[PDB]
Motif scaffolding. Structure first.
Motif, PDB file in Angstrom:
ATOM      1  N   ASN A 155       0.866  -1.215   0.000  1.00  0.00           N
ATOM      2  CA  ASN A 155       0.000   0.000   0.000  1.00  0.00           C
ATOM      3  C   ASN A 155       0.888   1.246   0.000  1.00  0.00           C
ATOM      4  N   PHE A 156       1.025   1.888  -1.133  1.00  0.00           N
ATOM      5  CA  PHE A 156       1.883   3.113  -1.221  1.00  0.00           C
ATOM      6  C   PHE A 156       1.150   4.196  -2.017  1.00  0.00           C
ATOM      7  N   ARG A 157       1.221   5.423  -1.565  1.00  0.00           N
ATOM      8  CA  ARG A 157       0.556   6.552  -2.290  1.00  0.00           C
ATOM      9  C   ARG A 157       1.653   7.405  -2.929  1.00  0.00           C
ATOM     10  N   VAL A 158       1.335   8.153  -3.955  1.00  0.00           N
ATOM     11  CA  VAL A 158       2.380   8.990  -4.625  1.00  0.00           C
ATOM     12  C   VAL A 158       1.797  10.338  -5.044  1.00  0.00           C
ATOM     13  N   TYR A 159       2.559  11.389  -4.878  1.00  0.00           N
ATOM     14  CA  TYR A 159       2.094  12.750  -5.286  1.00  0.00           C
ATOM     15  C   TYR A 159       2.895  13.160  -6.520  1.00  0.00           C
ATOM     16  N   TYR A 160       2.359  14.003  -7.359  1.00  0.00           N
ATOM     17  CA  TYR A 160       3.123  14.402  -8.577  1.00  0.00           C
ATOM     18  C   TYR A 160       2.631  15.756  -9.086  1.00  0.00           C
ATOM     19  N   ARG A 161       3.487  16.485  -9.753  1.00  0.00           N
ATOM     20  CA  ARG A 161       3.088  17.821 -10.287  1.00  0.00           C
ATOM     21  C   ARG A 161       2.647  17.682 -11.743  1.00  0.00           C
ATOM     22  N   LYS A 171      -0.157  17.213  -6.997  1.00  0.00           N
ATOM     23  CA  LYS A 171      -1.549  16.735  -7.301  1.00  0.00           C
ATOM     24  C   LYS A 171      -1.963  15.663  -6.289  1.00  0.00           C
ATOM     25  N   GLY A 172      -3.243  15.412  -6.174  1.00  0.00           N
ATOM     26  CA  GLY A 172      -3.734  14.384  -5.206  1.00  0.00           C
ATOM     27  C   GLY A 172      -2.844  13.129  -5.265  1.00  0.00           C
ATOM     28  N   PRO A 173      -2.968  12.264  -4.272  1.00  0.00           N
ATOM     29  CA  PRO A 173      -2.170  11.020  -4.223  1.00  0.00           C
ATOM     30  C   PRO A 173      -2.562  10.078  -5.372  1.00  0.00           C
ATOM     31  N   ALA A 174      -1.685   9.167  -5.719  1.00  0.00           N
ATOM     32  CA  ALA A 174      -1.981   8.191  -6.811  1.00  0.00           C
ATOM     33  C   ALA A 174      -1.490   6.805  -6.382  1.00  0.00           C
ATOM     34  N   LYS A 175      -1.792   5.783  -7.143  1.00  0.00           N
ATOM     35  CA  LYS A 175      -1.341   4.406  -6.765  1.00  0.00           C
ATOM     36  C   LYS A 175       0.004   4.092  -7.432  1.00  0.00           C
ATOM     37  N   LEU A 176       0.919   3.519  -6.688  1.00  0.00           N
ATOM     38  CA  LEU A 176       2.263   3.176  -7.250  1.00  0.00           C
ATOM     39  C   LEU A 176       2.216   1.776  -7.875  1.00  0.00           C
ATOM     40  N   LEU A 177       2.597   1.653  -9.128  1.00  0.00           N
ATOM     41  CA  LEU A 177       2.579   0.316  -9.812  1.00  0.00           C
ATOM     42  C   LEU A 177       4.001  -0.083 -10.234  1.00  0.00           C
ATOM     43  N   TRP A 178       4.522   0.532 -11.267  1.00  0.00           N
ATOM     44  CA  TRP A 178       5.891   0.172 -11.751  1.00  0.00           C
ATOM     45  C   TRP A 178       6.940   1.036 -11.038  1.00  0.00           C
ATOM     46  N   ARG A 205      11.831  12.138 -10.449  1.00  0.00           N
ATOM     47  CA  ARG A 205      12.243  13.452  -9.872  1.00  0.00           C
ATOM     48  C   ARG A 205      11.048  14.411  -9.780  1.00  0.00           C
ATOM     49  N   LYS A 206       9.900  14.022 -10.286  1.00  0.00           N
ATOM     50  CA  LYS A 206       8.693  14.914 -10.219  1.00  0.00           C
ATOM     51  C   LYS A 206       7.595  14.205  -9.421  1.00  0.00           C
ATOM     52  N   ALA A 207       7.967  13.198  -8.669  1.00  0.00           N
ATOM     53  CA  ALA A 207       6.972  12.446  -7.846  1.00  0.00           C
ATOM     54  C   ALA A 207       7.570  12.178  -6.462  1.00  0.00           C
ATOM     55  N   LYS A 208       6.771  11.710  -5.536  1.00  0.00           N
ATOM     56  CA  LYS A 208       7.287  11.420  -4.159  1.00  0.00           C
ATOM     57  C   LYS A 208       6.664  10.118  -3.656  1.00  0.00           C
ATOM     58  N   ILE A 209       7.466   9.222  -3.142  1.00  0.00           N
ATOM     59  CA  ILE A 209       6.922   7.925  -2.640  1.00  0.00           C
ATOM     60  C   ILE A 209       6.505   8.058  -1.176  1.00  0.00           C
TER      61      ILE A 209
END
Lengths: 52, 52
Positions: free
Chosen positions: A4-10, A18-25, A45-49
């Motif tokens: 279960n991991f969420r990710v933010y991105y611009r 931007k809102g959180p997203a689901k991490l796949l690859w 470099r434009k996202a955060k785990i």
């Protein structure tokens, strides 16, 4: 291995996160995620785990 | 679970198939692959899973 991991991105229209997203690859400096019902590619470099 | 698998896909500028690519993500009707040194998303209905 991705539990279960969420990710933010611009977006390219605004450096605002931007809102959180689901991490796949996860590998090189890139991460595949899914916000709505569509998967897209985002540079690491434009996202955060974040942990859930 | 993805061992040695090759994948063919058509471009948006021409319905002609393209050289083989590496299969990475596999789930819904979509498949992530890598042709040159860049990963992209391709609809499963526009790609073919070939065994190596």
């Amino acid at each position: 291995m991705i539990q279960n991991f969420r990710v933010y991105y611009r977006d390219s229209r605004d450096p605002v996160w931007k809102g959180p997203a689901k991490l796949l690859w996860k590998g090189e400096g890139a991460v595949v995620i899914q916000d709505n019902s569509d998967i897209k590619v985002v540079p690491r470099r434009k996202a955060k785990i974040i942990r859930d």
